[PDB]
Amino acid sequence: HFTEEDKATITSLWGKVNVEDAGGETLGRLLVVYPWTQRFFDSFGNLSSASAIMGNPKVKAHGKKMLTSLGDAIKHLDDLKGTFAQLSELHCDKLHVDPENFKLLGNVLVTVLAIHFGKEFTPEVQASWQKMVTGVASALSSRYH
């Protein structure tokens, strides 16, 4: 249920987003704010504090990879489930990530968009992005069911 305005708002803001910077910032903040999530990223090296996590090149690279696959979905908002079908099998079967973590990461992303857009990130614009976040988390949980 992406409304016409939802689609329009989400497409506009994503155009203005620097994916590499939002991605690294997003994954990094997930790791700092929600420490248990570091269990899935043991091989990335030192994740002991805000300073270590945010300057970590592997965290930067990987968040950029996260965020770009999200950008794929924005081109095709009506079939989020399809787009994320293989990443679902990945995060579920291989990585064993609990689905609640998908909502946590999406909420961190919303706060990173807020930082970037400031007063442009109105309560209405945020409501559209919360829908996107919910939709994405849903699509990633799909191979859990």
Binding site: G28, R29, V32, V33, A50, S51, I53, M54, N107, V110, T111, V112, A114, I115, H116, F117, G118, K119, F121, P123, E124, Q126, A127, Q130
Partner: protein
Amino acid sequence: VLSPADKTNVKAAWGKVGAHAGEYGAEALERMFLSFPTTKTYFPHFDLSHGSAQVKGHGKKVADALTNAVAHVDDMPNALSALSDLHAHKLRVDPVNFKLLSHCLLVTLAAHLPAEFTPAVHASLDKFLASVSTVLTS
């Protein structure tokens, strides 16, 4: 438990809010009402429309209690001990919806203080809002 840098960050961040704490409290509520309509059912006797004076007034109360809590990070369960009985026992608020308001407050702060909303401060603010939440639930 909150580290010394956590208390320092929370107090720093709340100082950067300046004179807009009431305003930011009201915007967090309004954000929560748009993104999460389920929270509106806790306010049956409120006008919740955009620009509402009741929302504006309630934001100042929330911001006041938060300001009060920041002043007493060391013995928080006590400083909010009064509020804890009202939310948990009387209003009966889902311990889950405290996360929604916490998210919306952080989004509001991010949107208004981008320079101040560093990762470290974001983590400190999140632990702070979680501790507040647990106090209002436990």
